RNA sequence: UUCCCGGGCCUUGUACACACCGCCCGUCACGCCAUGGGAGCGGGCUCUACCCGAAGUCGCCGGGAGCCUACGGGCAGGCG
């Protein structure tokens, strides 16, 4: 038997392919399904992805933002059915996979440390030319 | 005729005139009032140094690059 393939097989029913590719440092908008009262709604969480934790179907990513003077971090399963869509709002270029360090940085310092990833921005623009 | 008691005349000092049985000082005791000191406690104002920093004018850029061309330009946008 191949235990890995069995697991991949169980996971296959839940795997997602509709979400855009992004890297740590990119700024991302996650439209997330949420439950309140008496209804469910979609709430956008927009911020820098500081971490992508890979384990295939089980990979998760972490998005950090400042909300009314307070740092907030959300952890999302990359294949969650509660993510309606993810929008790339900016491409950042980091020089490491985990950006924990920006927790200690001023907004000004972060803006210096993560400059726009012009290579991947151009790529986005080259695509998005629809036939 | 020094002393005690009463008085008369002259004079002298007096913070006494209720007139020396006068006036009056301070502790202590009780009561009230205001202030000072006092481990500290609370608050107001202020000064200095540094960290972060909105809006905004100003200055640079405006390109791996968008839009308007009015194209040796402008706006977006970026930096300070
Ligand atoms: Mg396994
Ligand atoms: Mg199998
Ligand atoms: Mg909301
Ligand atoms: Mg942020
Ligand atoms: Mg849905
Ligand atoms: Mg006599
Ligand atoms: Mg006589
Ligand atoms: Mg006499
Ligand atoms: Mg005398
Ligand atoms: Mg006299
Ligand atoms: Mg007292
Ligand atoms: Mg006192
Ligand atoms: Mg006192
Ligand atoms: Mg005092
Ligand atoms: Mg005080
Ligand atoms: Mg004080
Ligand atoms: Mg400091
Ligand atoms: Mg400053
Ligand atoms: Mg130009
Ligand atoms: Mg400007």
From Swiss-Prot:
This is Large ribosomal subunit protein bL19. NCBIfam families: rplS_bact. It comes from Thermus thermophilus (strain ATCC 27634 / DSM 579 / HB8). InterPro entries: Ribosomal_bL19, Ribosomal_bL19_CS, Ribosomal_bL19_sf, Translation_prot_SH3-like_sf. Gene3D superfamilies: 2.30.30.790. GO terms for molecular function: rRNA binding; structural constituent of ribosome. GO terms for cellular component: cytosolic large ribosomal subunit. Contacts the 16S rRNA of the 30S subunit (part of bridge B6), connecting the 2 subunits. Part of the 50S risobomal subunit. Contacts protein L14. Forms a bridge to the 30S subunit in the 70S ribosome, contacting the 16S rRNA. Keywords: Ribonucleoprotein, Ribosomal protein, RNA-binding, rRNA-binding. It comes from the Bacteria. Belongs to the bacterial ribosomal protein bL19 family. Pfam families: Ribosomal_L19. One of its GO terms (biological process) is translation.
């Amino acid at each position: 038997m191949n235990r890995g393939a069995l697991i991949k097989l169980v996971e296959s029913r839940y795997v997602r392919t509709d979400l855009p590719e992004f890297r740590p440092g990119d700024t991302v908008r996650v439209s997330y399904k949420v439950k309140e009262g008496n209804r469910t709604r979609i709430q956008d969480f927009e911020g820098i992805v500081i971490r992508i934790r890979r384990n295939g179907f089980n990979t998760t990513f972490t998005v950090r933002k400042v909300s009314y003077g307070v740092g907030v971090e959300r952890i999302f399963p990359l294949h969650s059915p509660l993510i309606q869509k993810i929008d790339i709002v900016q491409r950042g270029r980091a020089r490491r996979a985990k950006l924990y360090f920006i927790r200690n940085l001023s907004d000004r310092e972060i803006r210096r440390k993560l400059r726009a990833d012009r290579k991947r921005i151009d790529q986005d623009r080259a695509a998005e030319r629809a036939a």
